[PDB]
């Protein structure tokens, strides 16, 4: 009476282990545990989304409005929330676009499932309901598609691609940020029209180097690349035309020492006198074959000796440090050189082509530039991103990664296959999925119905973040899809969507003239991985933890 | 704010020393820290709060009168706002939430004037000339309350006091209740001056049906239990006599320091009998008077209960002093502290007894209450509030108690003004033209004083979770044309405010919301006198306890 028996036969397992079954409203608590961090994502989706401060134990801060990025640093206790972390991590790695959406949907499917489990629907039927809804959802995304790119390189078409992507992360001004990406995409692409070759594009080609100071308007698009290096011997503006040559060596510019106990041995004074001059003549003789080929800059892979440096700057050969593997490989793709570890003569076919190598003050430190010209184009271009706050450089840099990741979406499938944005693609599926529930019989119809109700979060979120009342903006938009028999045949009611700024009522003046669209490849895997996030959380009825 | 200052550098004080603009900033954050809990409770869109005493007990409260009294603050600059909330509850009885927000913003908006090298003496002078100019403008714009032939100058007054409460939806039912209650308990004093004693009506903490089905008692309801269970509970028939006694009726000892001493043991039993008999002689003459109902402040011993059970008299013990004066005042009796007269004899006259039509004891959810109705000489009233529990009824008790004070003032002073931040927005347009006339440095003081008055209509929109600038800009547009009305009624664009349930600007006279002008007068002076007290402080000297 004074004390319970405190759960007998509990010594089967350790004291730290705990069980969590579906009963006792614990599945409702797991939905509430998702609801804690899901509401943090409500303020972070859309162009009016708000970034988030995340102070780690080390003190490294990252400011961001994306989900996959913010969830990396937060240490999570609930395992069901970690499914959303790895689900968004999969979204960032594969497609690099549409992660707030994964969280927003996989969280609202669990929200509407709170009503379904409370009604009395078995968990097995819930998975069958969303799977049958998923097959119809992915089918209709291919049907209501409009428009296509059909050209890899164009000035006006890239404005339709990059601009709606970076509009979520650090909107700012539209033109100054979009032109930096569309100019850099055209440099790296192998155009090769009327040849029948397979296109190819690498995410690691376009890379952004962060430099403090300046303003966002002063950002330029560099053909080549840049490091924060210092030439050792001398600096040269290189005002001499008639382009220079490039030779890349991965080994250090020094005498190839013996790997096993390299030690001097001098038996008599005759070897003592010649050993000091032998190293000078040997290093000089190797530079003669290198210098006669007309090379004026050599990129070293490791530490360079002083004696080798004395003969390099004699003939005015520039030295560059790249003490890492990937930093040396990215530079060969610009000039198109084939490195060889030997210290002999570079082959003439393997020598690279760089016209000028300038050294100027951008951020107060010494930097080396490798700008090419219109002739003999190169790939793996960089973008000089100027800004005041280092935290803003980090989020804008990842926005270029999201934009570069969107360019990857054009290579693998047959084409662009753009969709209407601004909630139009979500609100259209609500009517189609609702009609699909009426066609199918059985107790799964409520699962099909709640699956459509979960898609309202995109227009509800954009209306809440835009400072508008969602009770008036949402049903005003339903009138465009509740309508029938209106004059025009060629119907233009599909482009109606929400609006962040402007006219009252809100149905946007089309997403058309506005030139904002969404990618099909993002919506396919996002709805697939979001449904898998809700499937794995709803399919499990018992959870076991340890130590907490 | 940044860091702690040096502790008595070549000054030799046992406590702490601080000076400069740092303490002036701490007073602003101190007034804003205590005002943030009052922000969300303002207006009908505000929500209630609960204060936990770390013993399980909690109480729901909306008004900042008792909230700040319960919140034990140690900073003395915040204590003035705590006492300001208690001060405004005593005199006016309404607007405790508004003076804290107004006084805090006047100090907050004046904080910018401090670092402009404007002295506080010049700032308060600019505030004071704006005050007396605002009081005269309030005296020009207000209106008397006979107002119209229909009443509804009292049904609409109750809605303003009843708003922002749990029973604000039921204010249509309770509006008729409060006006019928205070019109019954009026009195006469000072040769024609009518008074309305607040708290004279009995607010009972009943549980049961709902707040909508709360029956208004046409008479006073005494909250006390019956002595014995074998007594008659219901007494019918007209002209029921009410006896109000206060003397000690239980058997008591002799004088406070005397000792009973007797040699003859024969009379030892006789002195015991007369001590038991002398207390029953008082009960004998009350039965001869024929008092059906008798009420006593002190206890009632079993020696007296047998006579009341036999003669069918309703004896009730454990009455309080303040209640029996209202029973005697309502039923027409007079308070009897002891039975005597100018002559040497001891007797009881029938004129001391009151009169009422019916007395019935009722029980509802373990709450026995004696319902006294039909007082012949003067009417009375009581309100039986019904809800979930006692802690929810405490909010209703404060809601009703504040409603009586507001309806008290509109009858004592017929002048009223509309709500919804009308006068707060009208004074800004009046003071801007006056600020340019005075010329010199007081323009910024009068201007920033006017900007601080706009916080009342702004807080109504912020707590509503709607767009505030559109409502303020539209309210600004109509009030801007009021000063330039160009008289020849067609004097429109005045007496308008915010409508939060719909989000539009409509006429407050037709909407049915008003407030007395005297509440605006005392709130502005008490808010400015509190602002004068905080601005004039320069350096703090906190002495640690020995």
């Amino acid at each position: 009476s004074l004390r319970l028996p405190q759960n007998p036969n509990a010594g089967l397992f350790k004291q730290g282990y705990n069980s969590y079954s579906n009963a006792d409203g614990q599945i409702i608590k797991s939905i509430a545990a998702i609801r804690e961090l899901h509401q943090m994502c409500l303020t972070s989706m859309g162009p009016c989304g708000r970034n988030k401060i995340i102070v780690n134990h080390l003190g490294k801060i990252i400011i961001t409005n994306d989900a996959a990025t913010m969830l990396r640093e937060l240490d999570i206790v609930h395992p069901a929330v970690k499914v959303l972390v790895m689900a968004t991590e999969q979204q960032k790695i594969d497609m690099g676009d549409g992660t707030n959406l994964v969280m927003i949907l996989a969280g609202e499917l669990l929200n509407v499932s709170e009503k379904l489990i409370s009604m009395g629907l078995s968990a097995v039927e819930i998975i069958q309901g969303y799977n049958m809804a998923r097959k119809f959802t992915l089918k209709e995304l291919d049907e209501m598609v409009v428009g296509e790119i059909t050209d890899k390189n164009d000035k006006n078409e890239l404005l339709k691609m990059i601009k709606p992507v970076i509009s979520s992360k650090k909107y700012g001004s539209e033109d100054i940020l979009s032109e930096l990406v569309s100019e850099a995409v055209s440099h790296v692409l192998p155009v090769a029209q009327q040849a029948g070759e397979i296109p190819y594009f690498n995410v690691d080609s376009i890379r952004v180097v962060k430099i403090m100071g300046g303003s966002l308007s002063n950002s330029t698009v560099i053909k080549g690349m840049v490091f924060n290096r210092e030439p050792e011997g001398h600096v040269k503006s290189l005002s001499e035309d008639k382009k220079h040559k490039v030779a890349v060596f991965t080994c250090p510019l020094d005498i190839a020492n013996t790997e096993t106990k390299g030690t001097v041995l001098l038996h008599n004074a005759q070897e003592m006198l010649d050993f000091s001059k032998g190293e000078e003549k040997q290093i000089d003789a190797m530079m003669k074959e290198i210098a006669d080929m007309g090379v004026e800059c050599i990129v070293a892979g490791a530490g360079v000796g002083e004696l080798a440096l004395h003969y390099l700057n004699r003939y005015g050969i520039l030295v560059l440090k790249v003490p890492s593997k990937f930093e040396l490989r990215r530079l060969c793709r610009v000039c198109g050189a084939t490195p060889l570890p030997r210290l002999g003569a570079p082959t003439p076919e393997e020598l690279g082509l760089v016209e000028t190598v300038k050294t100027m003050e951008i951020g107060g430190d010494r930097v080396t530039v490798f700008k090419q010209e219109q002739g003999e184009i190169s790939r793996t271009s960089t973008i000089i991103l100027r800004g005041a706050t280092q935290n803003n450089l980090d989020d804008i840099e990842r926005a270029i990664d999201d934009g570069v990741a969107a360019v990857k979406g054009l290579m693998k499938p047959s084409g662009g296959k753009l969709l209407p944005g601004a909630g139009a693609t979500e609100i259209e599926l609500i009517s189609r999925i609702t009609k699909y529930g009426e066609r199918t019989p059985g107790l799964l119809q409520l699962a099909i119905k709640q699956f459509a109700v979960a898609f309202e979060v995109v227009p509800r979120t954009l209306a809440e973040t835009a400072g508008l009342d969602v009770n008036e903006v949402l049903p005003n938009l339903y009138a465009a899809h509740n309508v029938t028999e209106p004059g025009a045949v060629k119907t233009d009611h599909l482009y109606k969507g929400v609006d962040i700024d402007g006219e009252s009522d809100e149905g946007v003046k089309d997403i058309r003239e506005e030139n904002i669209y969404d990618m099909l490849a993002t919506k396919k895997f996002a709805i697939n991985v979001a449904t898998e996030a809700a499937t794995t959380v709803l399919s499990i009825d018992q959870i076991i933890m340890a130590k907490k | 704010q940044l860091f702690n200052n040096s502790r008595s550098d070549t000054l030799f004080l046992g406590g702490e020393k601080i000076s400069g603009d740092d303490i002036r900033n701490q007073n602003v954050l101190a007034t804003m820290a205590v005002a943030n809990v009052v922000k969300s409770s303002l207006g009908p869109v505000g929500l209630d709060k609960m204060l936990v005493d770390d013993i399980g007990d909690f109480t729901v409260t909306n008004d900042g009168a008792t909230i700040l009294s319960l919140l034990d603050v140690q900073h003395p600059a915040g204590k003035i706002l705590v006492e300001l909330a208690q001060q405004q509850d005593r005199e006016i009885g309404d607007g405790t939430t508004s003076v804290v927000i107004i006084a805090s913003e006047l100090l907050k908006r004046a904080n910018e004037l401090v670092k402009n090298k404007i002295h506080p003496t010049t700032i308060i002078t600019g505030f004071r000339v704006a005050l007396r100019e605002a009081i005269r403008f309030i005296n020009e714009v207000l209106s008397t309350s006979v107002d119209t032939l229909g009443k509804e100058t009292l049904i609409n007054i109750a809605k303003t006091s009843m708003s922002s409460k749990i029973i604000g939806a039921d204010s249509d039912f309770f509006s008729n209740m409060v006006v019928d209650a205070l019109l019954a308990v009026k009195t006469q004093n000072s040769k024609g001056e009518i008074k309305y004693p607040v708290k004279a009506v009995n607010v009972l903490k009943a549980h049961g049906k709902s707040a909508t089905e709360s029956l208004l008692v046409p008479g006073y309801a005494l909250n006390c239990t019956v002595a014995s269970q074998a007594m008659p509970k219901r007494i019918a028939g007209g002209n029921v006599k009410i006896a109000c006694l206060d003397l000690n009726l239980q058997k008591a000892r002799m004088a406070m320091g005397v000792q009973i001493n007797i040699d003859d043991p024969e009379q030892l039993e006789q002195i015991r009998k007369r001590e038991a008999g002398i207390v029953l002689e008082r009960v004998k003459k009350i039965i001869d008077a024929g008092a059906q109902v008798v009420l006593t402040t002190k206890g009632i011993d079993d020696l007296c209960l047998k006579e009341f059970v036999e003669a069918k008299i309703m004896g009730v013990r454990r009455c309080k002093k303040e209640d029996l004066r209202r029973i005697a005042r309502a039923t027409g009796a007079t308070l009897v502290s002891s039975m005597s007269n100018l002559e040497g004899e001891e007797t009881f006259e029938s004129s001391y007894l009151g009169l009422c039509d019916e007395v019935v004891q009722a029980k509802f959810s373990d709450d026995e209450c004696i319902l006294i109705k039909g007082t012949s000489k003067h009417s009375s009233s009581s309100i039986i509030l019904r809800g979930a529990n006692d802690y929810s009824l405490d909010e209703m008790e404060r809601s009703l108690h504040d409603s009586l004070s507001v309806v008290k003032r509109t009858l004592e002073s017929g002048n009223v003004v509309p709500g919804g931040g009308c006068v707060e927005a009208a004074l800004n347009i009046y003071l801007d033209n006056f600020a340019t006339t005075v010329g010199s440095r007081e323009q910024l003081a009068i201007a920033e004083f006017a900007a601080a008055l706009l916080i009342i209509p702004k807080t109504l929109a912020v707590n509503a979770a709607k767009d505030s600038s559109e409502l303020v800009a539209k309210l600004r547009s109509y009030h801007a044309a009021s000063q330039m009305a160009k008289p020849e009624k067609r004097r429109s664009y005045r007496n308008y405010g915010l409508d939060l349930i719909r989000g539009k600007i409509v006429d407050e006279i037709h909407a049915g919301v008003l407030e007395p002008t005297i509440s605006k007068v005392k709130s502005l002076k008490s808010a400015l006198e509190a602002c004068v007290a905080i601005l004039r402080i320069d350096t703090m000297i906190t002495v640690d306890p020995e």
Binding site: - | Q250, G257, Q259, G299
Partner: protein, 191 residues
Amino acid sequence: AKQHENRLEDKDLSDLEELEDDEDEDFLEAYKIKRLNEIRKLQERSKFGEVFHINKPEYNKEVTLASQGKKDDGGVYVFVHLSLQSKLQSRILSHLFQSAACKFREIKFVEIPANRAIENYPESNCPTLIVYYRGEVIKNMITLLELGGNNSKMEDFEDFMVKVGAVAEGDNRLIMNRDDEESREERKLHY
């Protein structure tokens, strides 16, 4: 554990009769004989009951010998009062002595003028309250600002007697423990 002890500890000889029908006779009457013996000891110890207005020669006996009592260490507390009729606190303390004398008959209540007590005593320090016990001074109390001053009451004086060990904490005669009959009547009805 305390529920079994409250049956006997929290009931006097008059209150122990309540449990005559409920509890066992041998359990109850065994304790009533114990409490009855304690009542008889207090009657034998009741050697006092009014203020002893004494004079000095006698002090050397009344105040001190008494404090020894039987000298079985039968000690006796002796509250002395150096009275001064000009002071207002002295007349208040004289009333408390006679009131407490009628209740606590075992404790001796002594009074004497302060001018006759000590040669050239400071009038400002009067009224003075001394408490002797077995010849030793237990408490040399100063003027009644500690006990409220001018607003001193009978409840404050009885509380002081418990601190010096003159009266037990749970004594039925103390006003703190001596609840009114009307108070206990309401408790039984609401129980």
